[PDB]
Amino acid sequence: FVNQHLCGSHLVEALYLVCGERGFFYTPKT
Amino acid sequence: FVNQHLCGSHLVEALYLVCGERGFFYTPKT
Amino acid sequence: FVNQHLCGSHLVEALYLVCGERGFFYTPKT
Amino acid sequence: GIVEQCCKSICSLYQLENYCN
Amino acid sequence: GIVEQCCKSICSLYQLENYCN
Amino acid sequence: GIVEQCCKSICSLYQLENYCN
Ligand SMILES: [Zn+2]
Numbered sequence: 001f002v003n004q005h006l007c008g009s010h011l012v013e014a015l016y017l018v019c020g021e022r023g024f025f026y027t028p029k030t
Numbered sequence: 031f032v033n034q035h036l037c038g039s040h041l042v043e044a045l046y047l048v049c050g051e052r053g054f055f056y057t058p059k060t
Numbered sequence: 061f062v063n064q065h066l067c068g069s070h071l072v073e074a075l076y077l078v079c080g081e082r083g084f085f086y087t088p089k090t
Numbered sequence: 091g092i093v094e095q096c097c098k099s100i101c102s103l104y105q106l107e108n109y110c111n
Numbered sequence: 112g113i114v115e116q117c118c119k120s121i122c123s124l125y126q127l128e129n130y131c132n
Numbered sequence: 133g134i135v136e137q138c139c140k141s142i143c144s145l146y147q148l149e150n151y152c153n
Contacts, residue, residue, distance in 0.1 A: 001124035006117050009040060010069060014117075018124065019131035026130070028114050031103035036096050039070060044096075048103065049110035056109070058093050061145035066138050074138075078145065079152035086151070088135050 006014045015024045036044045045054045066074045075084045092109050095101055113130050116122055134151050137143055 001127070003121060004068065005119075005121055006127075007114075008034065011113065011117055014127060015130055018127050022131045024131050027112055029112060030115070031106070033100060035098075035100055036106075037093075038064065041092065041096055044106060045109055048106050052110045054110050057091055059091060060094070061148070063142060065140075065142055066148075067135075071134065071138055074148060075151055078148050082152045084152050087133055089133060090136070 001014075001018070012026055015026060031044075031048070042056055045056060061074075061078070072086055075086060092106075096106060113127075117127060134148075138148060
């Protein structure tokens with residue numbers, strides 16, 4: 001996988017590819 | 031809607047979702 | 061074409077549009 | 091324009107809808 | 112969360128898969 | 133490469149077409 005900082009909608013799209021049929025959760029809070 | 035700064039093609043894609051069947055105008059000039 | 065700095069996946073998507081049926085090569089190394 | 095409101099500052103759903111037709 | 116690991120720092124394929132279901 | 137021309141600087145339509153096949 002790419003060696004860059006993944007942010008915004010690119011981070012969500014990374015998660016989409018990497019999980020696939022498993023799906024994911026994006027909870028961006030501190 | 032998201033609390034981030036929307037720029038470039040992400041700003042145009044925000045406008046696409048938010049208007050839908052109304053459409054939009056993107057004129058980026060100062 | 062747009063007068064901005066094209067990076068990341070936006071640079072690859074620029075190359076996709078600009079070449080089309082010719083295709084391209086993305087080799088990001090220094 | 092929109093690049094001073096929604097990119098240099100932040101835009102809510104309504105301040106962005108003013109750029110629809 | 113994920114915005115401290117994969118955005119403020121860099122994430123490999125595995126540190127990102129921990130955010131799958 | 134392309135990351136020094138089109139990302140660190142700006143590329144017109146032609147300087148980007150040199151990266152096609
Ligand atoms: Zn982007």
